[PDB]
Nucleic acid binder design. Structure first.
Ligand code: MG
Ligand code: MG
Ligand code: MG
Ligand code: MG
Ligand code: MG
Ligand code: MG
Ligand code: MG
Ligand code: MG
Ligand code: MG
Ligand code: MG
Ligand code: MG
Ligand code: MG
Ligand code: MG
Ligand code: MG
Ligand code: MG
Ligand code: MG
Ligand code: MG
Ligand code: MG
Ligand code: MG
Ligand code: MG
Ligand code: MG
Ligand code: MG
Ligand code: MG
Ligand code: MG
Ligand code: MG
Ligand code: MG
Ligand code: MG
Ligand code: MG
Ligand code: MG
Ligand code: MG
Ligand code: MG
Ligand code: MG
Ligand code: MG
Ligand code: MG
Ligand code: MG
Ligand code: MG
Ligand code: MG
Ligand code: MG
Ligand code: MG
Ligand code: MG
Ligand code: MG
Ligand code: MG
Ligand code: MG
Ligand code: MG
Ligand code: MG
Ligand code: MG
Lengths: 68, 223, 102, 94, 43
RNA sequence: GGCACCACCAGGAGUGGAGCCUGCGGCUUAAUUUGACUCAACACGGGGAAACUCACCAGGUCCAGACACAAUAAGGAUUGACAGAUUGAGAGCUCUUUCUUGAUUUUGUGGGUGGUGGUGCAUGGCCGUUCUUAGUUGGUGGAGUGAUUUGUCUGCUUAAUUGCGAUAACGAACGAGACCUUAACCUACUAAAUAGUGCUGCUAGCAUUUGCUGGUAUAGUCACUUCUUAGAGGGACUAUCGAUUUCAAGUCGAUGGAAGUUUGAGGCAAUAACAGGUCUGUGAUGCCCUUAGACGUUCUGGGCCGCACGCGCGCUACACUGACGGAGCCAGCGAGUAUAAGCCUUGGCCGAGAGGUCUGGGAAAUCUUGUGAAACUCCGUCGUGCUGGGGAUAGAGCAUUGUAAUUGUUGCUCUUCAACGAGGAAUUCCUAGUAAGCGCAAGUCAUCAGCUUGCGUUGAUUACGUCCCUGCCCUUUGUACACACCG
């Protein structure tokens, strides 16, 4: 399965509550932004966080999300 | 003589492994931590880290002089080709080897286990360790043997970081009724690491909001 | 016995110091106008030893698989012999051993 | 042990007051005392038996070191002048 | 330490051992004729 | 309720049936040393034992019994010994025999020391198992006098206590996940005479059109990094789009992509626990036993292989989707030495072979080596026949290793050519480069691989589901158990 974990789910939603204006609906742009916003120890976690942040951003434009 | 590359790097490792145990048996009472073999032209620098650098360098450095001679005569080295230095460990509390050797010298003095165990729990944490857990196994007056764990603080268990931020030391303690086995696991604080990673893999540090400025309609500031 | 085509062979277990010594020599071979060839990454050799986990012979048949990676690099220099040897002392590292062959 | 072979064992454990011997009893020559290797082990087993040398064993090797009390013993028994090397006060380094 | 006592006096006695040693150890750091000739002089 | 090819469904390959290899029990034995007995004992102790190993058996040596004493002792305490006897022995082991050495040492006391001797039910460490299942824990708040409890859950979802969500809980930690190693992509960087290529010198063969195959090339003092190597990076995050869903966590389809099963595979891996296994790994150990006619150690010979039998891991096969005979002819993982005590060995020359011999290369991306491996493919012989399937058992002979091959180490040649004609009740492993074949290398190793650990060649059938069997986990429940049903 592809269930994201809590270390990526809670860390991604802190970004939205803190840097929503600079975020976007594009993963490639989000991936570069999170490399200068957060100190991520591994490259794999950086893309995972931005990939779920993009999903939340894509979901926010359709209505209000829980936890943000 | 002519030794292959595969067989030469292994020989250096085997030489280190045998040399390291030699210090553990000889300098056990001085809190021996580890040895560093710094090869250099025309010399073989060996750096030993011990809690007490007086027992090694005692009575006008007689023991260290008489100890380097035991290595020239066993490895067929030139008398000038090796130099041994004794260096004090900076943070004695962060070295599990020193803490395990120190505990053995207390257990062999008849001190109670609870008083001895808490003496290393607080000494490790006092030095700034992120976590520490001590397990002592064996037999004490009772015919049946038992083990007791003494944890404190934060400890990681799985994955690569245990190889990066945790050092461990096990020694056997010779008692009148049998052998006591002690394990001293010390996790150092990753923020103070100077060679490897400086944080745990899943530690995410989000920056602060730089926003909440006031925007003015449309001027131009010339220079 | 002057300018020669000189080989320096670098072997070590760890790559960080190997590339630092390799890059430091290349750096010193750059500001000094000495033509150079390298570094050449030799195929790394994986020394593998597979033992049984059990000190005794009881339990599930479980095996350890230990490894010892050996990385070897050779660099070719065109300089007099006095110049190359003093470069070695500039870039001396405990982990990496150096052998020089003409 | 012949008295003469015993002697060479004593002027090696003095002047370089440490002795290393590999654990093989049938070795013809300990490569540093021109006598049987077994003689070296048993001759120094008596000295450590009488508190003149510390003995340490690691990886099938004997590490013999001469006590300060043992220098006095060879001072008189060897009938040597009252003037080894690991005690020459070469002093350490900082 | 199989009692409510001797572990009480194991912690308070154990911790004062370290507190005495951290300060002592942190103070320990802040204030930091030959022979072969006699065998050849038989001339 | 839930999960799981060490469970099942659909299937594949089988095992159990034959011969043989090997392990276990048994029997036997002079000894056939010993541990382990469901999973988690039985090709396991890296245990493929000629000697050694070795612990067993029949015999023969040595002290390598330190040290304080006491005795003896230079008018010699003691050690070595030719020759003959004795002995398996050119062991002065011992006996006749007188020579030699000289306070090292002989006897008694204590004290040692050494034990593959006993105790893994006295211990350390290590390892296996519960279990790699998903479980474990505290702070504040709520409930209870308390031990405790909630948090840690109806439901959906996930490989997962992992997430959504419900919520007297809120916010967290270990474990999981993250992490690390490896495999797959990069005509985008960095270079490579120990890698490769095109050109270019020089050069060969075939048709002559200037073409096609080569050799040569460590001075052509060339060009380049695609193939090869490896360091710094980039790249996949379920990306975009459709469906379902509490529109949530997610799941299933397409499209793009090297990769969309956690991208494939592993390494590490929580809180406790077991009388699990090892004192036969340790100069790791407590205690007991032994310690000179040794249970130490060594030498010789045998045994661990011994054979009416039961069991387990396997290898060959029962043929034609095949055997032979020629021919074609492709990998990857790896290893390799010196005055040794002998490594990998091409090339040449002998030999039917096995093997022998002379040189040379390689401490290695250089040489062995493109390890020209085997299955495989083509063309032939065979023609359903215990046949040219199968190759036990055995006779005679030829080589290698080793001090030593007898109880055949192994290899080679000729001959003999057995059961076996697809295997009962039962039972194992497995979902994609997987299973199955098929070999090759590394470990053990003087010699011996039907064994493991890996590697690559050819390469599928059938699910992608369930709790029916089996095992485990969770919830509820009962309990006279708590040394916890071995109660
Ligand atoms: Mg973790
Ligand atoms: Mg993990
Ligand atoms: Mg089954
Ligand atoms: Mg079935
Ligand atoms: Mg069947
Ligand atoms: Mg079969
Ligand atoms: Mg034997
Ligand atoms: Mg024998
Ligand atoms: Mg036997
Ligand atoms: Mg024995
Ligand atoms: Mg046990
Ligand atoms: Mg145990
Ligand atoms: Mg609470
Ligand atoms: Mg409370
Ligand atoms: Mg209350
Ligand atoms: Mg609870
Ligand atoms: Mg959890
Ligand atoms: Mg964790
Ligand atoms: Mg060339
Ligand atoms: Mg050409
Ligand atoms: Mg993985
Ligand atoms: Mg038992
Ligand atoms: Mg024992
Ligand atoms: Mg034993
Ligand atoms: Mg053991
Ligand atoms: Mg014992
Ligand atoms: Mg033992
Ligand atoms: Mg054994
Ligand atoms: Mg005997
Ligand atoms: Mg056997
Ligand atoms: Mg037999
Ligand atoms: Mg037999
Ligand atoms: Mg098996
Ligand atoms: Mg088995
Ligand atoms: Mg054929
Ligand atoms: Mg054929
Ligand atoms: Mg090759
Ligand atoms: Mg026939
Ligand atoms: Mg046939
Ligand atoms: Mg035959
Ligand atoms: Mg079954
Ligand atoms: Mg054999
Ligand atoms: Mg082999
Ligand atoms: Mg085997
Ligand atoms: Mg069921
Ligand atoms: Mg109850």
């Amino acid at each position: 399965g592809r269930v994201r974990t809590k270390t990526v789910k809670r860390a991604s939603k802190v970004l939205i509550e803190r840097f929503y204006p600079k975020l976007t609906l594009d993963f490639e742009t989000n991936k570069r932004l999170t490399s200068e916003i957060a100190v991520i120890q591994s490259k794999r976690l950086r893309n995972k966080i931005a990939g779920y942040t993009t999903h939340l951003m894509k979901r926010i434009q359709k209505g209000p999300v829980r936890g943000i | 003589a002519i030794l292959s590359k595969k067989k030469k790097l292994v020989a250096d490792g085997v030489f280190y492994a045998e040399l390291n145990e030699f210090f553990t048996r000889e300098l056990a009472e001085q809190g021996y931590a580890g040895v560093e073999v710094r090869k250099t032209p025309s010399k073989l620098e060996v750096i030993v880290k011990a809690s007490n650098t007086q027992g090694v360098l005692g009575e006008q450095g007689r023991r260290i002089h008489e100890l380097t001679s035991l290595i020239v005569k066993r490895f067929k080295l030139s008398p000038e080709g090796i130099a041994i230095y004794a260096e004090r460990v900076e943070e004695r509390g962060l070295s599990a080897a020193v803490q395990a050797e120190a505990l053995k010298a207390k257990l062999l003095s008849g001190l109670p286990i609870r008083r001895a165990a808490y003496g290393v729990l607080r000494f490790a944490m006092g030095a700034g360790a992120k976590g520490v857990e001590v397990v002592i196994s064996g037999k004490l007056r009772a015919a049946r043997a038992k083990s007791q764990k003494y944890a404190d603080g934060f400890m990681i268990h799985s994955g690569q970081p245990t190889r990066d931020f945790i050092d461990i030391a096990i020694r056997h303690v010779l008692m009148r009724q049998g052998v006591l086995g002690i394990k001293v696991k010390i996790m150092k604080d990753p923020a103070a690491n100077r060679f490897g990673p400086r944080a745990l893999p899943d530690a995410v540090k989000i920056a602060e909001a730089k926003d909440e400025d006031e925007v003015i309609p449309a001027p131009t500031v010339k220079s | 016995q002057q300018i020669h085509k000189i080989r320096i062979t670098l072997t070590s277990t760890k790559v960080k110091q190997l590339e630092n010594v390799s890059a430091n020599i290349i750096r010193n071979a750059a500001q000094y106008n000495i033509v150079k060839k390298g570094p050449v990454r030799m195929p790394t050799k994986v020394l593998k030893i597979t033992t049984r986990k059990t000190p005794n012979g009881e339990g599930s048949k479980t095996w350890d698989a230990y490894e010892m990676r050996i990385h070897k690099r050779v660099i070719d220099l065109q300089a007099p012999a006095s110049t190359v040897k003093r470069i070695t002392q500039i870039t001396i590292e405990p982990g990496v051993d150096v052998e020089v062959t003409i | 042990i012949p008295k003469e072979d015993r002697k060479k064992i004593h002027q090696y454990l003095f002047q370089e007051g440490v002795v290393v011997a590999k654990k093989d009893f049938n070795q013809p020559k300990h490569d540093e005392i021109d006598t049987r290797n077994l003689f070296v082990i048993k001759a120094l087993q008596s000295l450590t038996s009488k508190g003149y040398v510390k003995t340490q064993f690691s990886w099938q090797y004997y590490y013999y070191t001469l006590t300060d009390e043992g220098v006095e013993f060879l001072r008189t028994e060897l009938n040597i002048p009252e003037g080894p090397l690991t005690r020459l006060k070469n002093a350490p380094a900082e | 330490g199989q009692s409510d006592k001797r572990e009480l006096e194991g912690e308070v006695e154990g911790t004062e051992d370290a507190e005495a040693e951290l300060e002592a150890e942190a103070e320990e750091n802040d204030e930091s004729y030959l022979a072969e000739l006699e065998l050849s002089k038989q001339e």
